[PDB]
Symmetry: C5
Subunit: 146 residues, 5 copies
């Protein structure tokens, strides 16, 4: 599947930036290299933390027009219940923003127990970069939307 006429939005948080970057990259590289998406047609905005992902996307979805958007962030279990509650709220939030807007929202949220699990899913230490999967998903959902 190729989508030269597709406009894609990518919002990512900045916590655990060491895992975020590889993910964003994989997502971008895959879209371009494999689906023929134009670099100029890929906006990349960012927010403080995962909590802000739904809100950031909603805002951007209103300003311009995209065919698909990818929310990227990584939450790591800490000492309190904070992890559980943010996670649940953010995931429900992204789903809402997508269903309300009609714009496909790809889940690029990692909810892990430790940094290692994150890096592994970001393609480091022998793992498969999930940002790639997200990229292809964005493209597919974008086309089917039209």
């Amino acid at each position: 599947l190729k989508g030269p006429e597709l406009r894609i939005l990518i919002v990512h948080a900045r916590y655990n930036l060491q895992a975020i970057e590889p993910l964003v990259k994989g997502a971008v590289e895959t879209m371009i290299e494999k689906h023929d998406v134009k670099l100029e047609n890929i906006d990349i905005e960012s927010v403080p933390g995962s909590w802000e992902l739904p809100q950031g996307i909603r805002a951007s979805i209103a300003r311009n027009t995209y065919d698909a958007v990818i929310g990227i962030g990584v939450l790591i279990k800490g000492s309190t219940m904070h992890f559980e509650y943010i996670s649940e709220a953010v995931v429900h939030g992204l789903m809402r923003v997508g269903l309300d807007s009609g714009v496909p929202v790809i889940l690029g949220l990692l909810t892990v127990l430790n940094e290692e699990q994150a890096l592994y899913r970001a393609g480091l230490n022998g793992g498969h970069n999930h940002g790639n999967d997200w990229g292809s998903a964005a493209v597919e959902m974008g086309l089917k939307a039209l």
Copy 2:
């Protein structure tokens, strides 16, 4: 119950495709063989993963008109909390799309601990294929909708 005039939509994800296929088949075979549904009246679309099920169905529900739709996907517990969160969000999502649209949405989502449990519910290794149940359910809900 027979529904020759029924138009059914089936959206399924592609992860764990080995379990997905038997499910879709059972759903289709049952509708046809037991409820007299016309093969031409059964659309079968697909999306990347379960996360996209609600969004894919919403989109399709807007394009054409169906009497019932079946969402099919299988989520398997991994090393992180990802499974728990996607599961909860997807299930709430499908329920929403159905209640908002007024179109019956049948739950063909398997949330299992391991691949074996999935295959078993797909009719392999001595189990009962649940896609069959979903097929009959789609038909029943479709008629009662009219």
Copy 3:
């Protein structure tokens, strides 16, 4: 409390039918025998499983007019997480249908660990039939709605 002019709707699923029936009966008998509800004023529709309860009620709530509705079904814990997710989604769903419509929705959903717990709450093996409680509740909420 008596409600001769009340119109009640009862939607029940068909899984674990052995527990369902006693429940529906108790609900009906109580409404009639104790609150003076007219048998002709009690509609009893049914759906495949608990998942369809919210959707079935929404549909019916649109076709006719009722003063109260009772959703009845029984979910039993199995080997997977399916039970947990359907349960949470269905309960949220019923609450939504009630709050959106303005029509009182009585919860006649049993979420048990095993069939015995269900039958017990259906009045068998020395237990108290909960359908009775639901019946009176339907009547009370119906009147206060007016």
Copy 4:
């Protein structure tokens, strides 16, 4: 803070009535004795169980006009998962009714493991009556609403 011109609504369920009463009392006494609320300006309606709280409040909120409302009920853990699901649904429901209506809704819901824990929070056996806290909260939220 005093609110002589405030109209307060109090809906309470009737299960575990032994814990409910002390709670309602404390709420009323505190509002009057400490915030100068007029007894005639305090409506007290009731419903069967906690499940009906959101629905009862919605109904009443539509009939008349209140500055604040207090939902009171006590759920006790039993042998099944029923407790967990009603609890989650009711709490989400009350929050919704408040946010949709714009009318402050005070949470007077006790979700305990056993009757003792309930009575203790109702001021018996050496505990502090939480209904008092709820009363003051109702008054504060009511004024700030204006």
Copy 5:
């Protein structure tokens, strides 16, 4: 990032006030000292408990106009399930108020097991004050909103 023209709202509950204060301070100090926010442009309202946070913010968001708002409160695990349910409901509530209003809502909610964990996250006993992070987040989201 600096936001001299930004109007920020801060609503905080009053339970566990010993942890609340340091948080509010850090939030204010950081906004001023590091982002050039004008003290006159920072409203600080308060409510009884965390349950009231969403409702308080909704009310204020309607009265005036803000570029960003910060909800602050701390919930501590007790003997009952109350903690879990308030937590889940409040977090979903804040997310809703933000998505409905279009106004960025920063999560300054601590859901801890004990007072120590709270104080630690408020900057005492060797910990980092999270109110600072929230302050910067408020500023960033506010600007991007424009």
